[PDB]
């Protein structure tokens, strides 16, 4: 996030980090319950990648995080790799997350929910702060 | 060129499709929602993370970080997967698995 600001540690407890087997962070995602994460289809997640929950400081080796293996990847079959439309993938975890002060789920909307233009919303992540 | 160690956040407005198409034109498709152009930008490594709004006091997932300006310009609209267009597919997938 360019020109964002540091979050309060643990205040976004559905935010996960998707990492390869070596610990490299390549995408974020959101816990929607103890067994499922929603993320983007273009992240290209596979069952060799891991969901890291409860993280704040990726440079801290001592933080209490949950490294969770992925059982199966459900890419939306309508994801359009030319137009980027329908950019959603579900990850079914092979071991459930343990909910806690720093790990819990975001709510999902209903399909007819309307969020007005101009509503102040929030986005989070460990993406670049400068390109 | 490296990512921050510590989780970042930014507040930002949802944009109407109409105001978003004033920059991105026909690249905006029916399962996309725009937000930002407000001095902040999602950038490399944010993809797949959340765009949340309050709905009845509780944070609700409205977008998934997807694409935008190729240099993460803070004055262009960021584009997110529109969760209301995709949540029926989410619920169907959970129910079947």
């Amino acid at each position: 996030i360019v020109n964002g600001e540091e979050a309060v540690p643990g205040s976004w407890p559905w935010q996960v980090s998707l990492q390869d087997k070596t610990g490299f962070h390549f995408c974020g995602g959101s816990l929607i319950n103890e067994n499922w994460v929603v993320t983007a289809a273009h992240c290209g997640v596979t069952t060799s990648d891991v969901v890291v929950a409860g993280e704040f400081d990726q440079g801290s080796s001592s933080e209490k995080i949950q490294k969770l293996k992925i059982a199966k990847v459900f890419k939306n079959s309508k994801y359009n790799s030319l137009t980027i439309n329908n950019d959603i993938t579900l990850l079914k975890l092979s071991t459930a997350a343990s909910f806690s002060q720093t790990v819990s789920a975001v709510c999902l909307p209903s399909a007819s929910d309307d969020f007005a233009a101009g509503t102040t919303c929030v986005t989070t992540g460990w993406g670049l702060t400068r390109y | 060129a490296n990512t921050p160690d510590r989780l970042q956040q930014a507040s930002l407005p949802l944009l109407s499709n109409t105001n978003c198409k004033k920059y991105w034109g026909t690249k905006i498709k029916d399962a996309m929602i725009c937000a930002g152009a407000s001095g902040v930008s999602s950038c490399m490594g944010d993809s797949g993370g959340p765009l949340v709004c309050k709905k009845n006091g509780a944070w609700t997932l409205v977008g998934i970080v997807s694409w935008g300006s190729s240099t993460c310009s803070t004055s262009t609209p960021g584009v997110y997967a529109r969760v209301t267009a995709l949540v029926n597919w989410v619920q169907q997938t959970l129910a079947a698995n």
């Binding site: 600001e5 979050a7 309060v8 540690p9 643990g10 205040s11 976004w12 407890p13 929607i32 806690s100 002060q101 720093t102 819990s104 789920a105 975001v106 709510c107 999902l108 929030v122 | 956040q9 507040s11 949340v52 709905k55 006091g57 509780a58 944070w59 609700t60």
Partner: peptide, 11 residues
């Protein structure tokens, strides 16, 4: 869902 145990602070 949607209610963090640690409340976010936005600026």
């Amino acid at each position: 869902c949607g209610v963090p145990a640690i409340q976010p602070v936005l600026s």
